[model samples]
Target: EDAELLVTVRGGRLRGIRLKTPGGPVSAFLGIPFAEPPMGPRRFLPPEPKQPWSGVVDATTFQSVCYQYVDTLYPGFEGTEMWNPNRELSEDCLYLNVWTPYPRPTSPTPVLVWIYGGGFYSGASSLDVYDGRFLVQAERTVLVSMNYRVGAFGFLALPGSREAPGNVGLLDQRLALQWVQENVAAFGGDPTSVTLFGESAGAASVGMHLLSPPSRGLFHRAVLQSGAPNGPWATVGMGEARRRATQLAHLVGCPPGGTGGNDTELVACLRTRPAQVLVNHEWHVLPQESVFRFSFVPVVDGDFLSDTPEALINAGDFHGLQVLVGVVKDEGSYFLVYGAPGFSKDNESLISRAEFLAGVRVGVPQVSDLAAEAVVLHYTDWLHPEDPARLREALSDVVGDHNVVCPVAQLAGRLAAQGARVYAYVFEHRASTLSWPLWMGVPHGYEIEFIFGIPLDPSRNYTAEEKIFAQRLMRYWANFARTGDPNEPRDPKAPQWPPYTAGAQQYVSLDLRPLEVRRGLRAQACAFWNRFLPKLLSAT
Candidate 1:
C-alpha cells in the first residue's frame, strides 16, 4: 500500500522505501550512488561523478560502509563501538542516503545534509545512530547523509600527480553536494537553502568547505559540532602528509620511495593490496603518543585545500555563511574514556603526576613544556574533592580544552570577527540512558541522539524530560536549516538562541533550561590556548 512512483534523479530512477519510526514515517532513499565507485582507476583520486544508469536502480537496500578497521580502544561492553557500522565494508562506497518526511512537505523544504565524523579515518552513513528519519520527521525537511571514503582510500596525498593529489574524500563530499543540488529538488528539497552540518572531523570538513573555493556556494549555512579547522587533528601538512603515506606504504610493503619514479606503481600497489589490511595497519603510521586521531585525515594539497585551515580562517576566507558551532561540557572525556579504558571506567582509578603531564604532551603535542605546566595548573580543579578521580577529570579537561573547547571558541571568534553570523552552544546535559560514568559530563558525540530526535521515540528508554529536551534541540537545528537562525520560526517553547558576535560572545546552554543564553564559554581555556600557548611557544 506504500507504492509510490520512482524518484527520478540525474543518476537514474530510484525506488526508495518508506521507513516507519517512532517519530513518524519517512521516505528513505538508501545507497544512491553519488559518484562512480572509487575503485580500480578511481582509487585515491577525486571521485568521478556517477555515470547514468541503464535501469531502475533500487535504492531501498542499505549499502556497505566504507572500508575501516576496528577502533581497538572502545570499552568492549557496547558490542563494538557505536561508530563501527555493520559488517559490510567496501571501497566501492561513494553512496548517500536521502530521507524525506512522510506525507512529504507540501512544497520545497529545507535540506539538512549530514557528514559523519570518524576523525576522517572511520565512519559510515549507515550507522544506526545517524539514521535521518527522526530528524526529517521533526523538521519536515529533507535529510541527506553520505558515505565518503575514509582513511587512506580517501585522503592519501601524493605530489607531482593529478591522479592522487589528495583529500579526495572531501571531494566526495563536494560531489554529494552537487548531487543534492541537481537532484534534491525532485524529492522536495530546497537546493538553495542547504545547511551542511557535521561533528568532529566532519565538522572540520564543514569548516574546510567554508574556506575551499570548490565547495563554495553549495550550502548556504553550516553547523560545526565539537570541531573546527584550527584543530591539529583535522589535517596533515605536506611534509607529514608524505611521511605518513610513505610509512603506510612501507608497512604495506609497497615501494616507500617518493613518487619520483614508480609513483604510478605506488597508487597501483595500494589498489592491489587488500583495503581492509591497509586500513587495519595504518594506525601504526601515526606517532603513538598523539591523541587518538587519524593518519589519513585531510591534507592542504593546494587544490582541494589551498592552505592550512587556520591560515584560511585567519585570512577571512570563510564567506558570509551563517554558522552554528558547539561542544559538549566534557568532549575530551569520551576520548580518554574510550582510549584509556582502565582509569576512565573505574571511579577509583587514577594516574600519577607524570601521567597527567604526559597526557597534555600527547593530546596537544605542540605545546611547549611551559604551556603544558600552565595547562595542568589551569585545569586542576581545587573546588572538586582532591582525590584520584579529580586528577583523572583534570586530565580529561586539559585534553578537551586544548583540542575541542578552546579551538572551537577560537573558530567562532575568527568567523564572527570576519563578519559571519554565528550561533554557539554548549551541550551540558549528561544522558541518563548511557552507560558512561556520570563524572564524564556530556561526553563527545553523546548529543547526537537528541539532535537526531532519537529521544522523542516513546518506545525507547528516554526519560520524559530527555524526550522534551530533544524536541527543542531538534527544532533549534531544524529552525537553523529552515532559515539560517536557530531561534527563528520562533516557537516560544524553546529558549532563544543568541547570535555569537565578536563583541559579547554569548552562547546558549542546549539542555532543557531557563535563560539558556550565557557567556564565558571556557574563557580561561580559550585565552590559554589562543594567547598563552602561542606566546609561550614563541619565547626565544
Candidate 2:
C-alpha cells in the first residue's frame, strides 16, 4: 500500500488518504470544496467559486450531502438503499472528491468526472457505488465526483426579476468543471482531456452542459448513460417551475404568492427560512402521472436553457464535443419496482391489459386511445395476456422504450446526423447477485457496477466471467476518456466500436461480453415514437 500524501491545489495544501486496490494503491482526496456553500444568502442561487483556504485542509472525510427526502417509503426500495442509501444532509454541500493512482505520474493523465443521478432531486457523491478507487487505479487515470444542489434549493424559479433563477444545480456542475480545469493538474490529471460522464439525471446534466455556453471547452468528451437533455422528464418550462416554487412557498409558510406578487420579498423570506423546512415539507409539485416523472427537473429558463432542449438540439446549438450515449436492456423496470404501488405486493408479477394501456398512456397522454392501443399492440400480444410473467416482461419492454431507450436512440441519431462523433451501447449483462428480481432484464443503473469495476457487496465473490467483464468494461470507458473512441481497447482482441452514423444507427450490444456491433437499437419502436407520435399529437 502507498503511504499518505499531501498535494497543493488551487485552494491550498491538502492531506488525503491512500487505499489498496486490485490494480495499485490509490490516493483519495475527499470532500474538497469546489464552490462556496449554497446556504444563507446564497441559497437558490448559482454557486460561486470557493474561496481559497489557509493551511492544509483535511481531505479525509466526505462532506455532508444535499438535503433530500429519503426513499424508505417505497416498496422494493431496499435494493435502492443498497446502491444509494441515505446520507447526512445539509445545505452546505458543494464538495467534490478525487481518486488517483499513487506515485504521481510524470505527465498529467486523463481525467473522468462522474455526476450522480436522482431525478434532479436526490444524489450524493459519497455513495459507495460511486467510489472512484477501482477505476482510477485500473485505468491509470484520475476520477472525480461532486455533490450539487437538488430539488427546490437547486432548481426553484419564480417570476420576479430578483427571484431564484433556474438551473442552479447545472451551474454548480459548470463551476466544478471550471475548478477541475484550473486544479486537476495538481492531482496529476490532464484537464484538457477531461471527460464528463453520468447516469440518468447526471447524464441529462451532461447533455445540458453540452448545450450550455458557459460549459463549452470545459470538457472534451461526454458519456451519457440512459439520459438526454431532451428526454421527456429532463426539462420543464419556467412557468411550471414558478408555480412549483409558489406551492413550496405556501407549504413552507412563506408568502404564498411571492409576497403578494413582489418577487424580491418572497425570495428574501425563503432565504431566511430553515433549510430543513424546505426539504421536509410535503411537496406536490408535479402530477403523479407516470413512474418516470420528475418534479424538480431542469427548466427552460431564458438564460441557462434559452429554449427547450429539443429546440436547442434541433437548432444545432450544442458544443461540438465527442459523445458516447447508451441505455440498459430494461432501464424502466426499476421505476416500476419503485414507483408503481401495484408492484409493492408480494407475488404481484402480472400486469393486466388495462394496466399496460394505462402505463402507455402515462408515456404519451397526448396520443389518442387508438394511438396508445397501437403502441400497446406494437409491443405485446393482446390475444393472450394471461401469462403473468410474460406480460410483466412485455410491460417492461414497453416502459423501457418509452422512458429511456427511444429518447436515447433519437438523441444519438440527431447527433450523428449533425456529423458529431457519437457511439451508443445497450447494457444486457445481468448480475448473478441482485437484491431485486433479475427477471426485469438488466435493470436501470445496473450497468454502473461493471462500469466502475466495483463489487456490489463485499461479502459476495464475483464469478471469473464477471471479473473479466469488469476489466473489459473499464478498458472501454478509460479508452474513451483517453481518446474519444472506446474501440481503442487496451486489449487488442476487443471488438472495434463503430461510431453511430445517420445511415446505420449502429450500436454495441453489451452482454456477457462486448457482443457484435448491431444496427437498429429499438428501431421500429423508436421510429413510431419519433415520426408518428409527434405528427399524431400535432394533428389535433
Q: How high is each candidate's TM-score?
A: 0.94, 0.94
**True-vs-predicted CA distance for residue 504, candidate 1, Å:** 0.8
- In the range 103-164, model 1's lDDT, one tens digit per residue, is 86668898999999988988888887788888888778999989999888888887557767
lDDT of 1 at 242: 81
lDDT of each structure? 0.81, 0.80
lDDT of 2: 0.80
Q: State model 1's lDDT.
A: 0.81
Model 2, 43-79: lDDT tens digits are: 8888999899999999988999898766765445556
Off by over 4 Å in 2: 1-4, 74-78, 83-86, 256-259, 317-320, 339-341, 363-371, 383-387, 456-459, 489-492
